Paper text:
Macrocyclic peptide 1 34 binds to a class of highly related eukaryotic adaptor proteins called 14-3-3. It was originally derived from the pathogenic protein ExoS and proves efficient in inhibiting the interaction between ExoS and 14-3-3 proteins. The ExoS/14-3-3-interaction plays a crucial role in Pseudomonas aeruginosa infections which play an important role in hospital-acquired infections. Here, we present the structure-based design of peptide macrocycles targeting the protein interaction site of human adaptor protein 14-3-3.
To investigate the binding mode of a truncated peptide in more detail, we aimed for a crystal structure of high affinity binder 11 (Et/Me) in complex with its target protein 14-3-3. The crystal structure harbors one 14-3-3 dimer in the asymmetric unit with each of the binding grooves occupied by 11 (Et/Me). For one peptide (chain C), the entire backbone and side chains are resolved. The electron density for peptide 11 (chain C) clearly shows the backbone as well as the location of side chains and crosslink. Superimposition of 11 (Et/Me) with starting peptide 1 reveals that both ligands bind to the same hydrophobic groove of 14-3-3. The two ligands show a close overlay (RMSD = 1.1 Å) in particular for the backbone and LDL-side chains (aa 7–9). The additional ethyl group at amino acid X3 in 11 (Et/Me) points towards cavity 1 thereby filling some of the partially unoccupied space observed for peptide 1. Overall, the crystal structure verifies the anticipated binding mode of 11 and the initial motivation to vary the size of the α-methyl group. In addition, we were able to obtain a crystal structure of high affinity ligand 11 (Et/Me) in complex with 14-3-3 verifying the anticipated interaction site and binding mode. This is an important finding as it supports the relevance of the conformational restrains applied during FEP. Considering the contribution of direct interactions (ΔpKd ≈ 2, based on FEP), our MD simulations suggest that conformational aspects account for ca. one third of the gain in binding affinity from 7 (H/H) to 11 (Et/Me).
Numbering used by the authors:
A (entry chain A): 3 to 205, 207 to 230
B (entry chain B): 2 to 205, 209 to 230
C (entry chain C), D (entry chain D): 421 to 428
The structure:
Amino acid sequence: KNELVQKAKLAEQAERYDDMAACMKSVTEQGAELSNEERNLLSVAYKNVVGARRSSWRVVSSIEQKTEGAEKKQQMAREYREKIETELRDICNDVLSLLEKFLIPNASQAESKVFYLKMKGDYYRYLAEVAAGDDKKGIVDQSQQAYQEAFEISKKEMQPTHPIRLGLALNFSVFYYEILNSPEKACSLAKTAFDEAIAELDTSEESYKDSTLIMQLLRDNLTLWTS
Amino acid sequence: DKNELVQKAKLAEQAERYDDMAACMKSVTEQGAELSNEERNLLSVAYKNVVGARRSSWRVVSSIEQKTEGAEKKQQMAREYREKIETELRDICNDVLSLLEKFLIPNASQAESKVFYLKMKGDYYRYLAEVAAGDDKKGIVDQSQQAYQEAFEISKKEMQPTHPIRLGLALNFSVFYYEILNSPEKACSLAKTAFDEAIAELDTESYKDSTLIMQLLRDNLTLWTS
Amino acid sequence: GXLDXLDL
Amino acid sequence: GXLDXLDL
C-alpha cells in the first residue's frame, strides 16, 4: 500500500536516499499521480541520488585536470570518472523514464506538470553535463525542450511567486549559463522571473520564505553571471 | 597490486564514494601487505564512513521505532527496515572483521599499529553489540571488551598519553564501557585514567590532532559526571 | 525542503 | 584524518 511511502519517509529520515528513491521509483511504477507529498519525497530521494553522483563526477572531473604529479593518473581518473558517469546516467535515465512513463502523463495539476517537466529538464541537463562526444548538442536541446515545455506551463497556470515556477526558473536559468553557455539568454530569464516575482511584494498572500529563498539564489546567480 | 588501488581510493574519498573507497582498501589489504599510514588511514576513513552511515542510519530508524514497539501495526515496518540496516551494518562490520581478524592484526608489523587495528576491533564489535539482538549480544560485547582491552595493554605503558591512537583508544573503550556495558563508573575510571596519564605527557600532528581527543574525554567525563 | 524538493 | 581515522 503506502507501506513504501512509510519506508521512504524512514529512508529519508535514515538518509538512505538510495532506498528512498527506489521506494518512490516503485510508487511511481504503481502508476498513480503521486501526492504532492509523495512527489516531494520522490524528488527528495532522487535529488540526493543524482546529487551524490554530480558532486562526485564534479570533483573527479576537476581532479581529472589536476592529475597526481604528471598526467599519468588521467587513465585512472577518467576510467573512474566514467564509472560515476555510468551510474549517473542510469539514475538520470531512470528518473527520466519515470517522467516520460508515469509522472508527466499522470500529473493532472498544472503545477505538478511544471515540476516533473522541470525534472525532465533537470535530469536531462544532468546528462548534458556528462554528455561528452557528439551527444550534448542534441541532449542539451533535449533538456531545453523539457525546460521550455515547463516554462510554457509555468508562465501560464502558475503565479510568479510559486517556488516551483521559481524553482524551474533558477534550474532553467542555470541551464542557459552552465550548459548552453549563453549568459545573455540565461541572465534575462532569471531576471525576468525574479523581476516578475518582485511586483508581487504581498502587501497578504504569498509563498512565504520558500519563494523568497529562490529569489536569493536567482539574484545570487544573476550577480555571479553579472561578473 | 596495492597502489593500483591506493590512488583510486584516494579519489573515492575525494568523490565521497566511501563504499567504493572501502572496496579498494579491501583489495589493498587482500594484496597481502602491512598497510602504510596513508593506506591504513584510508581503510579506516573508507570503512568508518561506510559503517558510520549505517550506524547513523540505524540510530535514526531505531529512534523512529520509538513510536511503536515490537508488536504493533505501525512500528512493525521500522523494525523490519532497522533489521535490514542491522544486517547491512553486520555484513559491513563482519567484512572489516574478516579483514581485521584474517590479516589486519597479524600482518601489522609495527607496535603502535597493533593498538590501532585492535581499537577497530573494540570499535567494530561495539557497533555489532549496539545492533546485536537477542542473547548473542552478551558474547559480541565480550568480543569488543577482549579487543579494546587487548589494545589497551599494548597502548598502556607503551606509548605516551600524548599518542592520539592511545587516546583514541581511551575515547572508544570508555564509550564502550558507558554506551554498551552501561557501566558509567568504569567508563569514567578509564577516561580519567587515560586523561590523567595523558596530562603528564609532553608533545610539540600531535599538537592539535592529539589535543582534540583529550577534549572529548573531558567532555565525556563531564557528560558522565552529571 | 525549499530547494531540496525542487533540486536547485 | 585525525578524528575520523581513529573514529572519535
